[PDB]
């Protein structure tokens with residue numbers, strides 16, 4: 001069952017010479033730079049208002065061209081077109097993978113089961129546009145005749161993370177509407193969210209692709225019950241909308257068909273904010289800004305699709321991460337956005353990347369014996385510098401990172417941006433080159449320490465450097481540039497998926513937790529000593545019954 005080609009990466013001629021080049025070459029950033037005054041010019045891409053500098057990576061020309069060779073030898077070009085043109089590359093679920101079509105604005109006709117999809121895509125977009133104008137303008141009144149003031153999106157993972165992150169990121173572009181985000185099945189979540197809300201002016205969005213997810217549906221029914229303390233059941237259709245592929249199950253909720261915002265099974269959850277799932281974003285910043293978001297993604301789309309690999313930003317991002325993950329044995333990749341607007345960006349890439357490539361079986365049905373998806377993590381700068389950058393600078397862990405920044409602040413205050421930016425430049429410079437023993441002894445003598453102090457202290461103040469980083473400079477955080485930046489990583493994950501020879505678009509690994517939880521749920525509701533599992537699950541459960 002093959003669509004995408006199934007070339008095992010550890011078998012290519014490129015992987016061989018990469019294994020050989022790594023084995024016989026020290027990659028010392030300070031060296032690579034001292035040897036070559038043009039290193040930055042050679043190892044960066046300046047696409048219009050965007051600088052992607054990959055020169056602080058642990059690569060020389062040879063490793064660089066060999067990693068390009070590997071993507072070519074894994075037939076990456078073939079894979080790109082299979083995705084964009086709608087081949088059923090999600091083979092285990094027999095699905096196409098067409099989040100790119102969600103933002104192509106009808107410039108391409110993609111056919112799925114003999115059906116052009118762009119009519120469908122633009123219909124829902126225009127549907128989100130007309131709906132949202134009526135909420136924002138205040139033409140769409142709640143049941144007592146008041147304007148909606150508050151929008152509560154309800155969903156989990158793919159139905160939560162993207163709307164959260166984007167709305168958080170584009171807070172400068174906000175409408176009048178307040179947005180709120182219920183996700184956890186923990187009832188304290190919706191309880192705290194609605195606590196100061198008014199059901200006369202609150203609009204609920206039930207985002208669930210399947211519309212069967214336990215967390216979402218429980219939150220939906222709590223939102224309904226909460227709403228029904230003030231409203232009538234015939235009023236549900238005025239305050240509840242749904243974003244799903246499951247129009248039948250939605251309609252049973254009391255949500256009107258007209259307010260079902262459809263998307264499709266070739267839109268993965270973690271790639272869905274571009275679709276109907278983006279509606280909370282539509283209401284949060286208006287549709288014009290949402291189109292600007294989809295346009296930024298399409299520009300990355302076009303760039304990834306047509307640009308030769310040496311100049312292809314997501315391809316470089318992808319092959320560089322394979323380098324660190326499989327050759328430098330690095331288990332993690334840090335995501336360090338120097339902007340408080342990107343406070344939920346690392347969290348979003350956690351699902352997009354790790355749920356996509358957290359696999360250990362190849363497209364052939366075979367267990368892999370090489371590492372696949374890494375651990376994605378981070379916090380914004382400069383905040384991270386005061387949490388975990390100590391470990392990056394001086395721990396035992398090799399942690400490659402992406403440092404993401406903007407030349408311009410949407411809110412420019414005194415010297416804030418230049419100070420922010422001064423850290424952005426310094427931390428990748430410090431991570432790359434460190435500070436040597438002689439550099440340390442010099443600062444210590446100048447500090448007036450006696451040789452005994454100097455002796456004891458030198459190693460604790462040394463930085464061996466040699467942490468690799470990518471640096472992104474966009475000009476300004478807008479919907480467009482955010483659309484670019486998200487789609488860069490989307491295509492990073494695709495690239496790495498193609499090379500690693502896995503399926504980036506299924507998620508069979510969630511099923512066992514779901515099943516075991518369905519067995520335990522009724523067990524917690526009765527009053528019996530539970531003995532049906534292992535001794536730990538038995539103990540945890542019975543302890544909970546005595547203290548619930």
Ligand SMILES: O=P(O)(O)OC[C@H]1O[C@H](O)[C@H](O)[C@@H](O)[C@@H]1O
Nearest residue numbers: 156157158159208209210213269
């Ligand atoms: O959108 P839903 O159908 O409610 O699914 C929400 C999430 O749950 C799934 O089990 C997976 O964890 C994600 O791929 C998905 O985004």
